[PDB]
Amino acid sequence: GAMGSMERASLIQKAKLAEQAERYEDMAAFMKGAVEKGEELSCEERNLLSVAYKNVVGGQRAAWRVLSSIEQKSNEKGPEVREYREKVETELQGVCDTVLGLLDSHLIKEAGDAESRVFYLKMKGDYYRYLAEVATGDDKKRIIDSARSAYQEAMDISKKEMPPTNPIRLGLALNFSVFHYEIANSPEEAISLAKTTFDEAMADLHTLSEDSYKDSTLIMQLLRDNLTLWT
Amino acid sequence: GAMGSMERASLIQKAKLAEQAERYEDMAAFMKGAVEKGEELSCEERNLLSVAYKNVVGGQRAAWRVLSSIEQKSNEKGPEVREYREKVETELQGVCDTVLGLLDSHLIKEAGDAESRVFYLKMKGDYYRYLAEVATGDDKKRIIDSARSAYQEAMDISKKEMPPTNPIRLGLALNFSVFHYEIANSPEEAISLAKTTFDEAMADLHTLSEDSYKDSTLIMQLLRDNLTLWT
Amino acid sequence: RSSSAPNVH
Amino acid sequence: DRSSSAPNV
Ligand SMILES: *CC(=O)N1CC2(C1)CN(S(=O)(=O)c1ccc(I)cc1)CCO2
Ligand SMILES: *CC(=O)N1CC2(C1)CN(S(=O)(=O)c1ccc(I)cc1)CCO2
Ligand SMILES: [Cl-]
Ligand SMILES: [Cl-]
Ligand SMILES: [Mg+2]
Ligand SMILES: [Mg+2]
Ligand SMILES: [Mg+2]
Ligand SMILES: [Mg+2]
Ligand SMILES: [Mg+2]
């Protein structure tokens, strides 16, 4: 790879530079290169990896939604809208395949603290979920099962190893509930998981850490918005 | 080119979709493919070309400025900032060279209406100016001479063939004045040109066309803003 | 649309 | 401040 000759420390340093420059494609390439050195990522470095690929794929998802919406209205003009939509779809799938391959090849493992292991399995579920949003057919059913399995395995870890207010546990629970509702056509499972997560966090508020209180509350805020939307 | 097999009309259609999806790199590629068919661009298509490359290069310039600022503030560390700045710089120069090549190879010509000829020559001056922002040494002197000649040639046409309120004439004069002030270290030339441009527009403002009032007055306000900044 | 965890920090 | 150039119309 183009990053194979660069020192790990320099890849992290340039990733932070690319984040300040809002150069998210660059930031992702640098962190992929750092992951491929084969050493573990710290929490701060995991955040760099997450921010980088979420910005890239998030932009493709938004674009795909705009294009898909325009495509729907020729059921209300040539192949160009479909062609261009398929092009963005293919790029989105390539980036998701890239994140999943890194997760499988380098990041998911038995070692590390629960935050790391829960973070990587959560991320695996998210990127299968993003693939599911655009998949169409026998491919899609497999993708949905893969997202579910990743989320559940992450969920088991977080419940055994983390307090109910841990921001990573909450964010995992939030996204899993989104998966149930938007992807797996399981609204009841979504409300129940969202409610139980919110409730058990509220009953165990003493486990909050000042360095992560703001993060925890934002996810709880979002669980409540989601329940308000879903009920 | 990657777009050589696609019909011109489909390239224009996809450029418009890419704008709706905020996929400006795609938009520029589509418009480059349209240019390379060798047919003339309409006013509307020229705006698509201009919007696509300004967004691409605009993001690179903002990034280059962020990184250059950090680089200078590391002179009051390792080579990583310079390397990443040089990487973004090299990409910026590539996009400018691409625009200058399209202008030289396909768009600038002796035929055509005043809007088209002035617009392309202004663009040539603008993209030599963006190269000048990151150039050093004897390279920078050559680039600055090229921007100036392009701008002057545009000015000569605009003064003979366009009214003083024409937004393309105004936007050219504004950018030429920025060139004088920020690039060629000629503050007096800049101040004089902005003043004359504002005055001659203000003296004809009553003749304004509904299709052009907004653009004209905004450029006029920018001229005045710069004069407040420079005096 | 439902809200997922945001791209924070 | 940087001088302002023509914006994206
Ligand atoms: C410490 C660690 O491993 N981190 C990775 C993280 C910090 C958290 N993730 S996340 O997807 O779990 C998340 C939690 C809270 C919020 I508000 C948003 C996202 C994202 C990367 O940073
Ligand atoms: C009709 C035509 O050729 N057009 C190109 C343009 C419309 C105008 N240019 S510009 O760079 O001359 C410009 C004019 C006014 C403003 I406010 C901003 C920029 C940009 C592309 O669209
Ligand atoms: Cl396409
Ligand atoms: Cl670099
Ligand atoms: Mg080493
Ligand atoms: Mg596809
Ligand atoms: Mg044709
Ligand atoms: Mg020091
Ligand atoms: Mg250099």
Residue from B5, B12, B56, B2 nearest B35 by CA: B12
Ligand 2: residues with CB < 6 A are B 43, 46-47, 50, 115, 119, 122, 167-168, 171, 215, 218-219; D 6-7, 9
CA separation for the pair B18, A87 (Å, rounded): 11
Q: Tally Cβ neighbours within 10 Å of residue B228.
A: 9
Phi and psi of B42, rounded to 5°?
-70, 170
B77 Cα–ligand 9 center, Å = 19
Report the alpha-carbon distance of residue B20 to residue A66 in Å, rounded: 7
Q: Would the CB atoms of D6 and B225 count as touching at under 8 Å?
A: no
Give whole-number Cα distances, B55 to B7, B107, B131, in Å: 24, 20, 16
Nearest CB among B54, B219, B222 relative to D8 is that of B54
Tokens of B104: 């030289």
Evaluate whether A93 touches A131 at the Cβ level (below 8 Å).
Answer: yes
CA A154 to chain centre: 12
Is the distance from CB of B54 to CB of B24 less than 8 angstroms?
no
Neighbours of C2 (CB within 10 A): 18
Which residues, in sequence order, are CB contacts of B152 under 8 Å at separation 6+? B176
How far is Cα B165 from Cα B167, in angstroms, rounded to an integer?
6
Write down the residue that tokens 């992290």 correspond to. Answer: A12
* DSSP collapsed to 3 states, B30-98: HHHHHHCCCCCCCHHHHHHHHHHHHHHHHHHHHHHHHHHHHHHHCCCCCCHHHHHHHHHHHHHHHHHHH
Query: DSSP class of residue A108?
Result: -
In this structure, the number of other CB atoms found within 10 A of the CB of residue A185 comes to: 10
Closest by alpha carbon to B119, among B51, B189, B17? B51
Distance between CA atoms of B97 and B216, rounded to whole angstroms?
A: 30
Residues of A with CB below 8 A from B23's CB?
A: 63, 88
Task: State how far the Cα of A8 lies from the Cα of A221, in Å rounded to an integer.
Answer: 37
CA gap A72, A80 in Å, rounded: 13
**For B136, which DSSP code?**
-
| Angstrom distance (rounded) from CA A77 to CA B202 | 46
Q: B32 and B63 in contact (C-beta within 8 Å)?
A: no
Identify which of D1, D3, D9 has the shortest CB distance to residue B215: D9
Say how many Å lie between the CA of residue A40 and the centre of ligand 5.
14
Torsion over CA: A126, A128, A129, A130 (sign): positive
User: What whole-number distance in Å separates Cα of residue A161 and Cα of residue A214?
Assistant: 21
Of B10, B66, B80, the CB nearest to A80: B10
Topology given in CATH for the domain delimited by B8-230: Delta-Endotoxin; domain 1 (1.20.190)
Q: What angle do CA B1, B5, B11 make, to 5 degrees?
A: 85
CB distance A22–B88 less than 8 Å? Answer: no
Ligand 2 pocket test target in B40, B47, B213 with most atoms within 8 Å of CB? B47
Spatial neighbors of B120 by CB under 8 A, at least 6 apart, are B103, B107, B108
Name which of B211, B151, B213, B212 is nearest B184 in CA terms: B151
Structure determination method: X-ray
Q: Is B110 helix (H, G, I), strand (E, B) or coil?
A: coil
The contacts of residue A140 (CB under 8 Å, 6+ apart) are A132
Resolution of the experimentally solved model in angstroms: 2.0
Half-sphere exposure of B150 (CA within 13 A, CB side): 26
